[PDB]
Design a protein around this ligand. Structure first.
Ligand code: SF4
Ligand code: SF4
Ligand code: SF4
Ligand code: SF4
Ligand code: F3S
Ligand code: F3S
Ligand SMILES: [Mg+2]
Ligand SMILES: [Mg+2]
Ligand code: NA
Ligand code: NA
Lengths: 551, 269, 551, 269
């Protein structure tokens, strides 16, 4: 009956429009729409397979690195290349460090202001705020004096009359539930997060050559020259520099981010009871550690009917079960060919017809796995790891829940993870586990170099004739990413990307079934239809990236 | 005291140019938005969304008419009457033209806004073009790169703020302090180039000695920028060539995203 | 009567031996001895005047920059050169940033372990330590959690059995008077100080080309090329980077260093009542801001009879009163010529005869000012500034005293500044005032460049015949420095440096009057003659640099 | 867990080499002394003094015999039986010979210890010599510079700790990763040198465009080092030439402290 539109949705990447039908004050139906297209799949066509990664990395600069690594993995798949183990270590360090930056920025810079009221922070007693965290965190930057400095920054900003990016936010909104002291704590951590994410990106830069957009990859390995005794190359001094930044990340992740996740949950417990996007979940394994593109540190898998006992593990990037299940349809997207297509047969022919609620309404295609809708991302990857009985994932989850229980006296069951907060918890768990990946892979690299292996690259043999098909999987910060390359007579004849936000933000599918964003919103109460904070909270929990979704 | 207003509009962008600000150190992004400028509109960072954020934009465009710096990130798609980038139900080109009317200075940040960039490459599916093409009567300051070092942008803005005028620009309206010289004309591997010391394959002996990357496809000889000197991320010694990969020419129209990675700089096929 | 030797004195620069006679548990007589000589004055002889600064900068790497600037000032004096004002701004920023690093390192890394017992810090309650700083400092890194992390570092170091540089210190010595909590506070700040001094040196590096040992000077100005629109030169981006580091120094200096000075004084009241080294004080004016080598930001002058009402201002580096008064005697030093020598006629002819109590016992010459023994350094510079009624100096001193009062209920009068703690307070005051110098001089540079002045260098004419004499004064971290150059037929015919630690550490002079170190020790109580911590406390307060003293 | 022991002896030093550690970032000096090594003796930082610090030296020599890295800073004066540098009443040459006998590795840090440096320049008043001259039978690792970038030293020590042997050395026993190439053979101003674009005076037009400093007396053509690549202080873009002053050749025997600042490369005196 009552229809609202949110366009643009802010604090995401790219251009997203959300519509909701509201019945009796609650969302009864929703539409997600990506409103910008570039045609990156077409732009990369007819080129040397080796060129693709530099072009398609530009699908997105928020999740920089991801499309680059997926693209080289796709060409390596097509050409049957075994990546040298040193190149795996380097790719793994880059991906883990990037994802650390990515998750931190998402929780604080992109998401926190959905839950945090900066004007309420002005009312806080900084001494009280500090005392609240006594015995809750060991973080060294939670003093009343630190909180006072932060509070004065907010005061100065407000007093200036130029709130800028903080202007006209949901200050005073009924759904803002934190006490003033907790709002102040959150703003202090928001600012501290900026330093931590910078350190994570210094790791990425030292191996990538810069960030955003790394430039050290190759079909066949990496471009870093390993030589301990070389001037101007990747030597021991450079490796020590990389290690110095890796060592700076864990304290913030464990003592601030992990803790804030539980604190938010404690003050917003009903958000463990809404925002479910799907009953099926899919994740790819990640961080290969052998010389044959396998032996992943993280397992992947497929779960149906929100039931962990259905878990089907995926531990190979050439698993035909995974490869053969994936299709996309443009029944409700602005493309010409509407029947479901497997990506090796995919087309991307624009057919813009304007937004309509029962027709085509998005530039995002609707992917399916064996014809079903699936949620991807840190919730999917967490649930797969729990189902796989990975001790580290259980322990990390239990740590967050323990803080929650200390604050509330209540517990969190697996059933409650299928929710807006569960999704956020999955992301935090991922970030925590990635710190071990960084330490492990750095050490593996140092050890392997000591065994006399400086190999970083194997030259591809690209046949001048014949057809070759390849797919590169990657578990990106937002979920399972796959690039699909067909090579014919030495050049790219088809290229299709199916991106995690494509899965989550996709419009109604070939069977008219809603995607995760659209499903997650049904049931959401709206205090003010003019300022639908509650919608934005759930959508942000998926960490939308529309340049990724649409490409 | 009041801070100078900046309005930032994203067209066909990947958000890499905004993300570059998160790596900046002088100023850091927090000092930028709290102390140096008033970021009046930016969709990535704004607390407000939907109707409220467009309200912020309108309010800013009126309140600071004649005084704001307009920054555009991304290419502008001309094909099919602008429908390939629609924000709040309107082609982005209309948002840009309206904002440009009251701008004190206009900056195209990134190669996409500067000259079309990756979105305009290949067959150019959306008819993407650079900002100057959309605003023919305006002086546009171009800060190319995919993305540029954030300080190429920040020092340009600082020059406007501190001395009241843009920095000196070249014939392509790029600031000379950052784009006034070819990378190859200030590259630390030039002695290797001169001597004939070239890497031929990643991981080979010359590559592992830090020799010149020309024969791997380095586009430094035809790319203007400061990548070899300012470099990236302020940790020292970090740019693509230093890491072991040739310059791809991402700053430069007709080089980046057009020439193959391993295509030589003197090869135009 | 017991005779003791301290050799080597550690936590200074260079090689120092101190001997003391002890009577009835108190030092009755002392000898200070510089035990290493290089002959830097002879090494630089017969060279082009332009070359001197790169050589004599190597007199010392602790007070790097200082000899470099003094040397070019001496050549500029001899050749009648007016230094461009932009070169003055740049020299000033370098000297001020260097001195900030120098003073911070002296208070913490060099001196703190005279007053702080790290083993006692193990006994501390971190929560009580944090609480006692409530209302004392606004510093944001004084939380119980920060102090706990620090205490654990000390604990792990001690548990390892490898105490390294912290082994066998004066732990448990009866003159250690801080409570466990304050020891822990001091160790935390010792570690935090290392980051602040690094930021100070990043300012120096960006203008100097590196540090230690800057490389941007010239007789005639500086080698920095100012061009706002130039690639690869000193442009606006580089200036912004410099400013970003300048801005990071003030909080630590004001909220940690300044506060800890008062904290130490609070627990060591009798140290405001001993350690006087002289009744006469000398300082040079510093930080010229015009195009004629003058208009100094800091005044200098001469005080006698420990009485500020005797103050004689010195406002020019060409002041003949200052120039004509300075002499050095080698009666008690290992050189051949013993009568007092004006430095333009000075000689440095080695004559090593070994140790003699009544004869020669040091490589340091004994300087005098019109025959008087004089203390130089931050105590001297503070007293001159107080005498001149410099408001900023009085204000900063008063702020330190107010913190002291909060802790003790006592105050500090000018009479008490002639002491070991007074000397330390003078250094702290200096460091605080330098932060405004940095801000002022950076701003002056930006303003001047805005007016269109990019001039940085005037090329000197070195006459091929004729004799020219010059003297370069500089107020260095340790006090008044002077380089004296004679040019004859285009080359250096004599070079003599009279260095701050030469004044303070000098042995008995031509009339057998003891130097400031030697005087300061008379009256010192000694708990343990084998571990004379009390002597070391007073000697360290002068910030000895023996490579400087002897050269 | 135990840390590798290091014994640091200062001879005729200016303390610049120790001070370089305070600029280091990987490791920082605090992480160095608490995590990376056990600094068993160092007079600049030691809490103990006099008899107690000498006790520390003796105890460490005995406890760690065959295990410690010996580092010497400064030249050793041989004239007049060693009296130009006396510590605890004994010539420094004896302290050094004593410590050298039980060392697992020996490093001469700085140009003074490496080859005599500034102290041995001019008429050499004290008969100053480098460490290898004092210890003819021992393998000495030379890490020259006045002072060197601290990571030239730290990464050498790390190689010894991590891989159990020194890094690859050149003919002068300098680690190749830091000294294996002339500065001029990896200098970003080489394109200007090639084109005849030379600064002639500080502050002239070419100087203010970042041109080559050869004719200002740059000793890059005859000096081995990593100053143009690793640079200094880890902030990016900081080394003498980048700041606008010629290399003085401080790394290189017979160049630094011998030749005039403005004397040209290959010209003798
Ligand atoms: S320029 Fe490169 S980075 Fe900046 S927006 Fe266009 S694509 Fe993303
Ligand atoms: S080709 Fe590339 S690597 Fe070689 S000198 Fe030129 S810019 Fe440098
Ligand atoms: S080398 Fe240069 S810096 Fe190191 S000690 Fe000798 S003089 Fe001081
Ligand atoms: S002479 Fe000096 S500045 Fe010129 S290229 Fe050689 S090393 Fe670089
Ligand atoms: S690819 Fe781009 S970032 Fe610089 S090194 Fe080349 S212009
Ligand atoms: S003077 Fe020395 S520091 Fe490097 S640039 Fe030249 S070798
Ligand atoms: Mg696709
Ligand atoms: Mg002298
Ligand atoms: Na709730
Ligand atoms: Na006392």
């Amino acid at each position: 009956s009552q229809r609202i539109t949110i366009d643009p949705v802010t604090r995401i990447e790219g251009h997203l429009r959300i519509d909701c039908e509201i019945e009796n004050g609650v969302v009864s139906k929703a539409w997600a729409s990506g409103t910008m297209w570039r045609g990156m799949e077409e732009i990369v066509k007819n080129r040397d397979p080796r060129d693709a990664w530099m072009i398609v990395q530009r699908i997105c600069g928020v999740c920089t690195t991801t499309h680059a690594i997926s693209s080289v993995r796709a060409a390596e798949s097509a050409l049957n290349i075994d990546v040298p183990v040193n190149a795996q270590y380097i790719r793994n360090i880059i991906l883990a460090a990037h994802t650390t930056h990515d998750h931190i920025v998402h929780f604080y810079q992109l998401s926190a202001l959905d839950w945090v009221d900066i004007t309420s922070a002005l009312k806080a007693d900084p001494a009280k705020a500090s005392a609240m965290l006594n015995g809750v965190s060991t973080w060294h930057l939670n003093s009343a004096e630190e909180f006072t400095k932060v509070q004065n920054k907010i005061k100065d900003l407000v007093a200036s009359g130029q709130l800028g990016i903080f202007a006209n936010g949901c200050w005073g909104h009924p759904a803002m539930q934190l006490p003033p002291e907790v709002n102040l704590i959150a703003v202090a951590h928001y600012l501290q997060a900026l330093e931590c994410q910078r350190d994570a990106n210094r790791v990425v830069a030292l191996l990538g050559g810069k960030t955003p957009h790394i430039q050290n990859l190759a079909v066949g390995g990496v471009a870093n020259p390993i030589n301990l005794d070389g001037l101007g190359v990747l030597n021991l001094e450079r490796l020590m520099y990389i290690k110095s930044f890796i060592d700076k990340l864990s304290d913030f992740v464990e003592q601030v981010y992990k803790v804030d996740t539980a604190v938010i949950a404690a003050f917003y417990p009903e958000w463990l009871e809404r925002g479910q996007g799907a009953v099926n979940y899919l994740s790819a394994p990640e961080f290969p550690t052998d010389g044959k593109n396998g032996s992943f540190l993280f397992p992947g898998g497929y779960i149906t009917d929100a039931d962990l006992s259905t878990y089907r593990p995926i531990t190979s990037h050439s698993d035909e079960y995974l490869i053969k299940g994936i299709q996309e349809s443009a029944k409700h997207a602005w493309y010409k060919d509407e029947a479901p297509q497997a990506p090796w047969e995919g087309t991307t022919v624009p057919d813009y017809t304007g937004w309509s609620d029962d027709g085509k309404y998005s530039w995002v295609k609707a992917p399916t796995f064996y014809g079903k809708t699936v949620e991807v991302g840190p919730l999917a990857n967490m649930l797969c790891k729990l189902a796989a009985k990975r001790e580290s994932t259980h322990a990390k989850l239990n740590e967050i829940v323990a803080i929650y229980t200390k604050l509330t006296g209540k517990t969190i069951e697996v059933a409650q993870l299928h929710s807006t907060l569960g999704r956020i918890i999955g992301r935090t768990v991922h970030c925590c586990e990635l710190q071990n990946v960084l330490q492990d892979q750095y050490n593996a690299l140092i050890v392997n170099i000591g065994k006399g292996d400086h190999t970083t690259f194997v030259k591809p043999d690209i046949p001048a004739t014949g057809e070759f098909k390849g797919v590169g999987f990657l578990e990106a910060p937002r979920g399972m990413l796959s690039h699909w390359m067909v090579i014919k007579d030495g050049i790219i004849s088809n290229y299709q990307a199916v991106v995690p936000s494509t899965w989550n933000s996709g419009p109604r599918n070939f069977n008219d079934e809603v995607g995760p964003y659209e499903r997650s919103l049904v049931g959401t109460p709206i205090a003010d239809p003019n300022k639908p904070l509650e919608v934005v909270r759930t959508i942000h929990s998926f960490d939308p990236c529309m340049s990724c979704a649409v490409h | 005291p009041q801070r100078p207003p900046v309005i930032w509009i994203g067209a066909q962008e990947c958000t890499g140019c905004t993300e570059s600000l998160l790596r900046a150190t002088h100023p850091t992004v927090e000092n930028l938005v709290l102390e140096t400028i008033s970021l009046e509109y930016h969709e990535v960072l704004s607390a407000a969304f939907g109707h409220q954020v467009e309200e912020n934009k309108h309010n800013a465009l009126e309140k600071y008419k004649g005084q704001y710096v307009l920054v555009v990130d991304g290419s502008i798609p001309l094909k099919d009457n602008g429908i390939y980038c629609m924000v709040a139900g309107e082609p982005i080109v209309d948002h840009i033209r309206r904002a440009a009317e009251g701008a004190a200075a206009i900056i195209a940040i990134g190669s996409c806004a500067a000259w079309g960039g990756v979105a305009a490459a290949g067959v150019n599916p959306t008819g993407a073009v650079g900002l100057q093409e959309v605003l023919p009567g305006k002086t546009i300051i171009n800060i190319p790169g995919c993305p540029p070092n954030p300080h190429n942008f920040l020092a340009t803005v600082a020059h406007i703020i501190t001395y009241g005028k843009p920095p000196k620009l070249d014939a392509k309206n790029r600031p000379t302090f950052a784009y006034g010289r070819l990378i190859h004309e200030h590259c630390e591997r030039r002695p290797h180039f001169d001597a004939g010391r070239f890497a031929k394959e990643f991981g080979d002996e010359g590559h592992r000695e830090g020799w010149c990357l020309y024969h791997l496809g380095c586009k430094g000889p035809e790319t203007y920028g400061n990548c070899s000197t300012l470099q990236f991320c302020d940790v020292g010694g970090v740019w693509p060539v230093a890491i072991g990969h040739p310059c791809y020419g991402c700053n430069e129209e007709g080089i980046g995203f057009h020439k193959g990675i391993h295509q030589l700089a003197h090869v135009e096929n």
